Amino acid sequence: HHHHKFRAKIVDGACLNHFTRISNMIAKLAKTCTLRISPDKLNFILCDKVSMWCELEQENFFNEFQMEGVSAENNEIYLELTSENLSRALKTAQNARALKIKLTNKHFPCLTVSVELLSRIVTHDIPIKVIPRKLWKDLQEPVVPDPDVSIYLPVLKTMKSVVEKMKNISNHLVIEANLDGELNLKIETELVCVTTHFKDLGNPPLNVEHMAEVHIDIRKLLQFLAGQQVNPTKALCNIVNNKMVHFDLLHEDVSLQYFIPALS
Amino acid sequence: MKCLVTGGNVKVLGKAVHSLSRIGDELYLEPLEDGLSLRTVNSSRSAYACFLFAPLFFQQYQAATPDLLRCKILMKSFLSVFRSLAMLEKTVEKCCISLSSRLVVQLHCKFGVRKTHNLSFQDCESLQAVFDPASCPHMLRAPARVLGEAVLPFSPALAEVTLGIGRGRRVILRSYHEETAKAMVTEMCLGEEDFQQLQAQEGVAITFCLKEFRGLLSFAESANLNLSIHFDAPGRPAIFTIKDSLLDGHFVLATLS
Amino acid sequence: SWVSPDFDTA
Amino acid sequence: YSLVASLDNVRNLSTILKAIHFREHATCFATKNGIKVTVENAKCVQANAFIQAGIFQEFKVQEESVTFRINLTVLLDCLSIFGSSPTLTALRMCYQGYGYPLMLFLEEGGVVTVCKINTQEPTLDFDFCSTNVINKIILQSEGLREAFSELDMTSEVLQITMSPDKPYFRLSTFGNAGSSHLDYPKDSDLMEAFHCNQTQVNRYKISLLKPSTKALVLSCKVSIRTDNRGFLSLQYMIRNEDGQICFVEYYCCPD
């Protein structure tokens, strides 16, 4: 076996379904996900090649939490699993009394999800791939390149609705923003041009308010917005002109960084 | 043959057809002295399903045609008549199944509306086969809604399920998997508390088709009936039984070796 | 041309 | 600007247009008493949606007939750009002439979407007049929806029987190993008017009449008429969210 170990437990129903929704939004974004276990944190990592970095402060979800890496100073655990598996497993966990997550190796290395129902126990043994330390270097949180424009996002529901019906028209979307609080979504074809204007969004502080834009795949954006079935406490859009759009979302002590590279 | 169904019974008849349609592709109709038999079989004949509607289930029941009907209809075509259980409950007041070379199904609906289906059929063999639950040493009984809850965690596309008797008189429901990438296993553990009867020794486990089991269970759920499971050893068939006042339903499923 | 609705009864 | 139209609610337009959406292109007629959108299919079918000028909060034309063809699916996608589950969405429609695009200004909560749809240059006229209508039936739409969304589609034809005698009004389909009849007595509470003078049995291609179900679902009353030729006319009286009455027409040739 590996001599790393992990066990955690959720009993707070609020963080428990909160944990569920995070799993379901990951299933939409990618089919394969990497989980990172630390003594203080839990990370969900996507390494598309469209990066995704999701961080959970452990002590805001679990009333019990304990882990141990293989080595001493490298006290981390990196796992690879299928997104659908975790989502289906946490479907039952969404409205339970309690939820247990533990690393097991019965038939094979697994992330066992135990769910206490109204007693009735549901056990899902999620197959996991243990990532060796050599490859941890490719699974770090991305550096944050200074954006040309940083702007607060509008309501994600209007964004989702607009983008989603724009998908029917085209797959190519241009998104742009100001330091004056404006953000535009824009598709353009031979027979129809559509531009949605958002204003009075405001900007986080710290040169002329001209548009910083980026041409992206509208499907990438839609996946991310669909996964946001709620409005967050903090929604930042960071645009690196003609290179990348970066979404910095905070939602009740749950960090979510999503990177969409420019197409073209 | 003339069958007349009225009141709430028209919907449960429709429910029975829906339940049967999740087992086989052809519906076998056999009007008997003890009522109307609706049967179907697996594509591989490893599953067998039967609903028997008592004569008093009908407001009018005549088995004989002044010979004796032993008939088969494409399941799709017969399911087509009872497609919408909502329409059956809201608009359909009476259903008449009569017999000519076509099987005539009339729906007497509200506001004098009448819908007539002329279904083609083929004369065929009886699908009667003996399957006595009393021969089975092991037995479970529980409310269908209890079992419906137990099956909820599994994937909708899950083919096989394992029903086992575990330590502490607990009933185990575990997903089954064949065969190079490993599958997540799901296990629901029930206490005997939710079961009305449990007669089976330890370590006894049978594996059968979940898709077909869902077929019968769905009928017993929307009727809030009890479902009995009679079984033996792995490789031997499992007999699933539901009973109501004026109708009997029993499913026979082969189990894995 | 516009529509000529034939819904008059009673 | 040849055509200028504005709505406090886009759904008073988009909803009705969805009831005739079975071709991706649609001819638009705009005259002094409202807008008429027309879709046709294989020269047997024609569906017309009529949104009168009284529906709009503002409506102006000057050239007494301005006509253009557009992409109805793109139009509908644009008109519903703020979600099909809304909190209203205002509209300002603007078309100023030949060679120039249809402009759409949709607003919701201060958020503004601007659509520019290019237009092409445009039709069937079935001389269906009341003076030569043989059979006419007016029915309560609600009590009829369940059934025609349930009519056999494996059949190639929909056979409509209208008669002063039994079975009075009958819809028949003929799928494989299935003869299916739908009968309505003139006695029925669904019959608001029964005026069948002559027994007539017509057949229509089901693929051609199926999209009319959309109109039927929106309607509260439906008018069914046939003439000497055997041509079918289906009229759907539709009540929008503002209680106003609009109309959708379906014409269809026999088989």
Say how far apart CA A53 and CA A44 lie, in whole Å: 6
Non-local (6+) Cβ contacts of C1 within 8 A are: none
How near does any CA of chain B get to the CA of A117, in Å? Answer: 10
Beta-strand runs (E) in chain B: 2-6, 26-32, 35-41, 47-53, 60-62, 71-74, 92-98, 102-109, 114-120, 122-123, 138-143, 160-166, 170-175, 185-190, 197-199, 205-209, 226-231, 238-243, 247-253
Conformational region of residue A218, where left means phi above 0, alpha means psi within -120 to 50, and beta covers everything else = alpha
* SS3 at position A151: strand
Residue A29, Cβ neighbours under 10 Å: how many?
A: 20
- Quick one: tokens of A179? 């330091």
- DSSP sequence for D182-226: EEE-TTSTTEEEEEE-S-EEEEEEHHHHTTHHHHHHHEEEEEEEE
B115 in D contact zone (CB under 8 Å)? yes
**Is the previous residue joined to D167 through a cis bond, with omega within 30 degrees of 0?**
yes
Nearest alpha carbon to residue A36 among A177, A165, A131: A131
When CB atoms are compared, the residue of A91, A120, A125 closest to B184 is A125
Say how far apart CA B115 and CA D185 lie, in whole Å: 12
Cα–Cα–Cα angle for A53, A58, A63, rounded to 5 degrees: 155
Dihedral (Cα; A206, A211, A216, A219), 10-degree rounding: 80
Range of the domain at D154: 1-255
Give Cα separations from B14 to B19, B83, B88, B216 (angstroms): 9, 8, 8, 13
Place of tokens 């008449």: B96
- Quick one: tokens of B226? 């009890």
CB distance D81–A193 less than 8 Å?
no
CB distance B113–D184 less than 8 Å?
yes
Residue B11, Cβ neighbours under 10 Å: how many?
A: 21
Amino acid at D135: N
Burial class (CB in 10 A: 0-12, 13-18, 19+), D167: middle
* SS3 at position B225: coil
What's B133's DSSP letter? G
Non-local (6+) Cβ contacts of A5 within 8 A are: A66, A67, A68, A103
* SS3 at position A116: strand
- Quick one: tokens of D110? 């201060």
Contact D79, D104 (CB under 8 A): yes
Amino acid at B15: K
Nearest alpha carbon to residue A121 among B155, B173, B140: B173
What are B209's strand-pairing partners? B160
DSSP element (H, E) containing B19: helix B9-20
CB distance A193–D78 less than 8 Å?
no
Place of tokens 């609706």: B38
Residue A203, Cβ neighbours under 10 Å: how many?
A: 18
Nearest alpha carbon to residue D94 among D150, D189, D30: D30
Angle of helix A83-93 relative to helix A13-29, nearest 10 degrees, comes to 160
- Quick one: tokens of D181? 């009849």
When CB atoms are compared, the residue of B153, B185, B191 closest to A125 is B185
Alpha-helical (H) ranges within A103-235 are 156-166, 218-226
Amino acid at D83: G
When CB atoms are compared, the residue of C2, C3, C9 closest to D192 is C9
* SS3 at position A178: coil
Residue B6, Cβ neighbours under 10 Å: how many?
A: 15
Contact A42, A36 (CB under 8 A): yes
Dihedral (Cα; A90, A94, A95, A97), 10-degree rounding: 60
CB distance D146–B91 less than 8 Å?
yes
Burial class (CB in 10 A: 0-12, 13-18, 19+), D224: buried
A80 in B contact zone (CB under 8 Å)? no
- Quick one: tokens of D130? 């009341």
- DSSP sequence for chain D: --EEEEES-THHHHHHHHTT-SSSEEEEEEETTEEEEEEEETTTEEEEEEEETTTSSEEEESSS-EEEEEEHHHHHHHHTTT-S-----EEEEEE-STT-PEEEEEEETTEEEEEEE--B---------GGGEEEEEEEESHHHHHHHTSS-SSSSEEEEEE-SSTTSEEEEEEETTEEEEEEE-TTSTTEEEEEE-S-EEEEEEHHHHTTHHHHHHHEEEEEEEEESS--EEEEEEEE-TTS-EEEEEEEE---
D186 in B contact zone (CB under 8 Å)? no
- The CATH number for D166's domain is 3.70.10.10
- The domain limits of chain B are 1-257
Residue A208, Cβ neighbours under 10 Å: how many?
A: 6
- Quick one: tokens of B116? 């007539």
Amino acid at A13: G
* SS3 at position B93: strand
Cα of A264 vs its chain's centroid, Å: 24
Say how far apart CA D215 and CA D55 lie, in whole Å: 18
Q: Which CATH architecture has domain A1-264?
A: Box (3.70)
Cα–Cα–Cα angle for D224, D26, D225, rounded to 5 degrees: 10
Pick B1-257's CATH classification: 3.40.50.720, 3.40.50.300, 3.70.10.10, 2.170.150.20.
3.70.10.10
A243 in B contact zone (CB under 8 Å)? no
Find chains touching chain D: ≥3 CB pairs under 8 Å: A, B, C
Say how far apart CA A153 and CA A157 lie, in whole Å: 11
* SS3 at position B73: strand
What SS3 string covers A219-240? HHHHHHHHCCCCCCCEEEEEEE
Say how far apart CA B255 and CA A193 lie, in whole Å: 60
Q: Half-sphere exposure of B107 toward its Cβ, with a 13 Å CA cutoff?
A: 31
Contact D72, D13 (CB under 8 A): no
Alpha-helical (H) ranges within A6-113 are 13-29, 83-93
Say how far apart CA B142 and CA A27 lie, in whole Å: 35
Say how far apart CA A33 and CA A46 lie, in whole Å: 6
Spell out the long-range contacts of B188-192 with Cβ–Cβ below 8 A and sequence spacing 24 or more.
B188/A120, B188/A121, B188/A122, B188/B150, B188/B151, B188/B153, B188/B154, B189/A120, B189/A121, B189/A122, B189/A123, B190/A120, B190/B146, B190/B150, B191/A119, B191/A120
Contact D73, D81 (CB under 8 A): no
Residues of A with CB under 8 A from a CB of D: 154, 157-158, 161-162, 165-166, 168-169, 190-200
Contact B221, B149 (CB under 8 A): no
Contact D88, D9 (CB under 8 A): yes
How near does any CA of chain B get to the CA of D68, in Å? Answer: 42
Conformational region of residue A3, where left means phi above 0, alpha means psi within -120 to 50, and beta covers everything else = alpha
- Quick one: tokens of D58? 């503002």
Split into its structural domains, chain D has a count of: 1
Query: Looking at chain C, which residue has its C-alpha nearest residue D138?
Result: C7
DSSP element (H, E) containing B78: helix B75-81
Antiparallel, parallel or unpaired: β A109-117 and A120-127: antiparallel
How near does any CA of chain D get to the CA of B104, in Å? Answer: 9
A264 in B contact zone (CB under 8 Å)? no
> What is the widest separation between alpha-carbon atoms in chain B?
63
Contact A174, A187 (CB under 8 A): yes
* SS3 at position B190: strand
Cα of B52 vs its chain's centroid, Å: 10
Nearest alpha carbon to residue B256 among B235, B231, B233: B235
Place of tokens 């409509």: D160
Helix, strand and coil in chain C, % to nearest 5: 0, 0, 100
* SS3 at position B137: coil
Whether there are 3 or more C-beta pairs closer than 8 Å between C and A is: no
Residue D227, Cβ neighbours under 10 Å: how many?
A: 19
Say how far apart CA A206 and CA D84 lie, in whole Å: 39
Say how far apart CA A261 and CA B181 lie, in whole Å: 31
What are A64's strand-pairing partners? A9
Phi–psi pair at A112, nearest 5 degrees: -80, 125
When CB atoms are compared, the residue of A157, A158, A192 closest to D115 is A192
